[PDB]
Design a protein around this ligand. Structure first.
Ligand SMILES: [Zn+2]
Ligand SMILES: [Zn+2]
Lengths: 906, 62, 116
RNA sequence: GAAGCUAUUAAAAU
RNA sequence: GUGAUUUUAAUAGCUUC
């Protein structure tokens, strides 16, 4: 009681013990430390403070707490001096220095239970079954009722989109903490005290409490290091929508919104004021317009801030910045500049306001530009979607339907005669041609609502991109001329509005090599926005989802080819690397891929995964990162200005552009387009980045005191240092980390698909990632929740990957050796046989190639333990004989022809 | 054997209805598509028969 | 490949001249000449110049919320309903849009209005 | 015939 | 009104060996 009343002191408050009498409590909380011995942000134990729960006049427990700390008499004498210097600041909690039994006691009064470190760790290391701290914080701060957690899948971003509002209820608290830390930094600077600011030394009210390691200097030379603080805090800002109060007048949530002018688009001063108000002591220089940046790293750094400041400004100030030129006296409306959400304002350099006449190149540019199409149209208001509706090109709305698939009665009846489709068969029909209604196209386009503005931890991303670029240093890239470009099928759509006059062959035949080169040189100094058309895809599937694809225009496709053709061909030609695009599964190409990933890992276990809605949810920061990584091969052919303008063109054409869906224009929030010239390679880059980030988080979130291996402990220490305390790139450590990854986390990547061989002891001890360290990374950097349904594990090597590229794996004997053979799904093969898209292809005697190709893919099943699986292949061989006999080469219906297709010798 | 016949017959029936210019009536096309998809996604013969005869009644009505 | 090109060249120019005749030159000139340097965002030209608006309504609740009555207001302007058309391109009168006839109606409806 | 090349058609994967 | 990329098969033609 004596200790309790001494702790109470002059601040009248009834306090109950929180612990065992007069002792020190033991709590488990998250900390951020960088000692010469241990470094990293993880959870540790605290036994140096005694807690004192506080009650009110109604004598029910409230969130106030009295925390007393017992430490070296030296800390006492010192902190006391520092607190005396920093007494006047309103962002500093109240301390009452005293001694009780004569051990010194530092009292911190009126503190919340949890800290910003706890909040940040809970949101950045989310686990579905270990979310007690997050649930308690949400309940305590009135973000949601205690019964909200009885709703299953409350944590999903897709099934429960109300969790976005529940999370956004914390924005005001986070903003208050930001303002208070700015106040504290200014106070230290005035006092002349240097010290490191960490999250764990700040309360959820924004009050600072630790002062042991603050060195005192002369007044006016105070230096507060906040790099780790701000970088670790960055991802939470957009998640909780901290800056949502800035859109009101005088930044007051009870006021009306600000009526911004419609003709204003600059916002440079607003961005600068926001930066100076919030990130005042951030050391690195900030460019509101990335056209003034100096490198790709600086572009990433500034665009990361731009994605956050862009939420304040109205959504109608982004897009092309049109003008009014006069062609031989005839006035036109052309787009000159462009306002990016991530790159600021870009102005074209070759602008001519008086064209005597326009040639083929100028006609192509003006026809691809959407300014005329949007200006000549009618206003559109579409309540079927939540996207911004730009205009309506026609006087009617177009509804697209999907027809059913045809039925092959001959093949079906032959299969019935051959004993398939019997009751209880493990082989059943699962793949069909699902039909859709009129509104399927717009309903599937509305799935872009899953794209949420995501801000990334920039200091972590800058090291991750450097590590990822090592995976692509074994290729050759650069720009090629117009006569070295290879186009596979010239009879394809040229996009809107070019598809009203011909196919892609017409324009390639019309414009010469000189004109193509001139257009490519134009794209390196100006921006050309283009319209994309969304088309429905008509295919066989196991789910009724109206899959839609984007048909990019010829003006974009041609110039992207002339920019990425060389690198993409080199990637497709290289064999035995991480990216396996171009490697055939025929002639042992499977075995050769599986041996390359098995490599020589020590305790091998296999794991794999796929992304939920990869194209719709992919953050724009990661998309720009992948584009910069691919464009890093142009160090000799293009300068910084040319590379930046090419990046701006790529963003304005395939990142957020006007999209045509049934005669109406809608703006794309972001993501990726399935019609790009670089879709698969960008997906591979994104996959590698997410895996590397998972590994970095798994290593850094581990207690360094429990790591027995001195090499690994030193590696973790230098990883933390090179990530948060070094601003330049350390090539030696980048190489060392890359070698560590290659030795213990091997990878095979094809777009959004990946198979991984890893050490199962390092994964057990927390030194490499797992399928839990990937739900956490996805949850905070991709705004999705990965379930156990897209995640598999295999502790065996004989049984290969559970699933890769839709094939399974088997270890069969081909002669004297054991090989691995990829076998697909019987149901898929039978469905492809029975249901066809064209009515003409139902004639068996006129389509032999279909069944020959289907038998090539169904051959492996002949060697499956399940007998009724192997009988699928023999069905196709007995049907091929019938087709030839009805028509009137024995090679097709002999097994050795197909057996020769999975044999090493070519 | 029981389910496969139902699903194939459903595919043929919806194709016939599409050829008979049912897309012109959006309200009919929506219900026909919904019944076809539910039959193709069904698991037991009980509900597939009911949705199949429901879809066949549309053809019998014209 | 030479006269094949000479066909599409006059097709692009014809389209690039037809759309100019559709521009609202009386109002567009004011918006352009009121900017700081004559440069304006594209997303506001239809909003502040379009003389015709098309609204697509999913169901009756949204209809009642948005396009109630003969005249409504949107985008700081007054629009007068001129015609309503269902998904079958059938003329729909304003009288049978209600609670009772909503199931009989074939949604969505495409409302066409003219600026005041 | 050995191999290469051009054209059309078809199947699969992302 | 029907996208980007990769592998494979079939028919046909041509030049080499
Ligand atoms: Zn910069
Ligand atoms: Zn280049």
């Amino acid at each position: 009681q004596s200790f309790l009343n001494r702790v109470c002191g002059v601040s009248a408050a009834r306090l109950t013990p929180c612990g065992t009498g007069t002792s020190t409590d033991v709590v488990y909380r998250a900390f951020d430390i960088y000692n010469d011995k241990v470094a990293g942000f993880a959870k540790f134990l605290k036994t140096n403070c005694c807690r004192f729960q506080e009650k009110d006049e109604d004598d029910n427990l409230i969130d106030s707490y009295f925390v007393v700390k017992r430490h070296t008499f030296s800390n006492y004498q010192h902190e006391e001096t520092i607190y005396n210097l920093l007494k006047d600041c309103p962002a500093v909690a109240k301390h009452d220095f005293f001694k009780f039994r004569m051990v010194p006691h530092i009292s911190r009064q009126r503190l919340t239970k949890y800290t910003m470190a706890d909040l940040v760790y809970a949101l950045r290391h989310f686990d579905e079954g270990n979310c007690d701290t997050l649930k308690e914080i949400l309940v305590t701060y009135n973000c949601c009722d205690d019964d909200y957690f009885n709703k299953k899948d409350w944590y999903d971003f897709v099934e429960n989109p109300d969790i976005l509002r529940v999370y956004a209820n914390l924005g005001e608290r986070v903003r208050q903490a930001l303002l208070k830390t700015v106040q504290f930094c200014d106070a230290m600077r005035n006092a002349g005290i240097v010290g490191v600011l960490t999250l764990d030394n700040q309360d959820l009210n924004g009050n600072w409490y630790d002062f042991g390691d603050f060195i005192q200097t002369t007044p006016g030379s105070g230096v507060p290091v906040v790099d780790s603080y701000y970088s670790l805090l960055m991802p939470i800002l957009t998640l909780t929508r901290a800056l949502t109060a800035e859109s009101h007048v005088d930044t007051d949530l009870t006021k009306p919104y600000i009526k911004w002018d419609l003709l204003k688009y600059d916002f440079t001063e607003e961005r600068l004021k926001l930066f100076d108000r919030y990130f005042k002591y951030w050391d690195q220089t900030y460019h509101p317009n990335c056209v003034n940046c100096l490198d790709d790293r600086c572009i990433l750094h500034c665009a990361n801030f731009n994605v956050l400041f862009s939420t304040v400004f109205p959504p109608t100030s982004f897009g092309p910045l049109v003008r009014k030129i006069f062609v031989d006296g005839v006035p036109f409306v052309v787009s000159t500049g462009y306002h990016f959400r991530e790159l600021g304002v870009v102005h074209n350099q070759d602008v001519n306001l008086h064209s005597s006449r326009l040639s083929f190149k100028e006609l192509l540019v003006y026809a691809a530009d959407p300014a005329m199409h949007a200006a000549s149209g009618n206003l559109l208001l579409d309540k079927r979607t939540t996207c911004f509706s730009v205009a309506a090109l026609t006087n009617n709305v177009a509804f697209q339907t999907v027809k059913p698939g045809n039925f092959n009665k001959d093949f079906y009846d032959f299969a019935v005669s051959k004993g398939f489709f019997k009751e209880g068969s493990s082989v059943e029909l699962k793949h069909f041609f699902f039909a859709q209604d009129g509104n399927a196209a717009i309903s599937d386009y509305d799935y872009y609502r899953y794209n949420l503005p995501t801000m990334c931890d920039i200091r972590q991303l800058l090291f991750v991109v450097e590590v990822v670029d090592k995976y692509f240093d074994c290729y050759d890239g650069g720009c090629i001329n117009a006569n070295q470009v290879i186009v596979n099928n010239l009879d394809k759509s040229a996009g809107f509005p070019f598809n009203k006059w011909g196919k892609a062959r017409l324009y390639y035949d019309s414009m010469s090599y000189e004109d193509q080169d001139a257009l490519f040189a134009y794209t390196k100094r100006n921006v050309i926005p283009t319209i994309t058309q969304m088309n429905l895809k008509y295919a066989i599937s196991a789910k009724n989802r109206a899959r839609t694809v984007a048909g990019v225009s010829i003006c974009s496709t041609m110039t992207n080819r002339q920019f990425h053709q060389k690198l993409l061909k080199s990637i497709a030609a290289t064999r035995g690397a991480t990216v396996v695009i171009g490697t055939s599964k025929f002639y042992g190409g499977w075995h050769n891929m599986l041996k390359t990933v098995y490599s020589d890992v020590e305790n091998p276990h296999l794991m794999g995964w796929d992304y939920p809605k990869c194209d719709r949810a992919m953050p724009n920061m990661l998309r720009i990162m992948a584009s910069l990584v691919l464009a890093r091969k142009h160090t000799t052919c293009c300068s910084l200005s040319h590379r930046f303008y090419r990046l701006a063109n790529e963003c304005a054409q395939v990142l957020s552009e006007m999209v045509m869906c049934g005669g109406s224009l809608y703006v794309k929030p972001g993501g990726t387009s399935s019609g790009d010239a670089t879709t698969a390679y960008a997906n591979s880059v994104f996959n590698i980045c997410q895996a590397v980030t998972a590994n970095v988080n798994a290593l850094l979130s581990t207690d360094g005191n429990k790591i027995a291996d001195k090499y690994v402990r030193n590696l973790q220490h230098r990883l933390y240092e090179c990530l948060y305390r070094n601003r330049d790139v350390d090539t030696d450590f980048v190489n060392e980390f890359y070698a560590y990854l290659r030795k213990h986390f091997s990878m095979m990547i094809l777009s959004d698909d990946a198979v991984v061989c890893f050490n199962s002891t390092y994964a057990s001890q927390g030194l490499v990632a797992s399928i839990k360290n990937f739900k956490s990374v996805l949850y905070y950097q991709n705004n999705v929740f990965m379930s156990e349904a897209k995640c598999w594990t295999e502790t065996d090597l004989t049984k290969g990957p559970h699933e890769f590229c839709s094939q399974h794996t088997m270890l069969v004997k081909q002669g004297d050796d054991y090989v691995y053979l990829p076998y697909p799904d019987p149901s898929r093969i039978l469905g492809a046989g029975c249901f066809v898209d064209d009515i003409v292809k139902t004639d068996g005697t006129l389509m032999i190639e279909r069944f020959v190709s289907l038998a090539i893919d169904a051959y492996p099943l002949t060697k499956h333990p399940n007998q009724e699986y192997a009988d699928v292949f023999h069905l196709y061989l007995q049907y091929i004989r019938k087709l030839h006999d009805e028509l009137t080469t024995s090679r097709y219906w002999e097994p050795e022809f197909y057996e020769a297709m999975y044999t090493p010798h070519t | 054997s029981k389910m496969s016949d139902v699903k194939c017959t459903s595919v043929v029936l919806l194709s016939v209805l599409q050829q008979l210019r049912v897309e012109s009536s959006s309200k009919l096309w929506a219900q026909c598509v919904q019944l076809h998809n539910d039959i193709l996604l069904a698991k037991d013969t009980t509900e597939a028969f009911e949705k199949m005869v429901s879809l066949l009644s549309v053809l019998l009505s014209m | 490949s030479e006269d094949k090109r000479a066909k599409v060249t006059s097709a692009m120019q014809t389209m690039l001249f037809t759309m100019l005749r559709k521009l609202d030159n009386d109002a567009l000139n004011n918006i352009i000449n009121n900017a700081r340097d004559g440069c304006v965002p594209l997303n506001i030209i239809p909003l502040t110049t379009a003389a015709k608006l098309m609204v697509v309504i999913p169901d009756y609740n949204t209809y009642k919320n948005t396009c109630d009555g003969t005249t409504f207001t949107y985008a700081s302007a007054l629009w007068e309903i001129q015609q309503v058309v269902d998904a079958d391109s059938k003329i729909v009168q304003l009288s049978e849009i209600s609670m009772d006839n909503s199931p009989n109606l074939a949604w969505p409806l495409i409302v066409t209005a003219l600026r005041a």
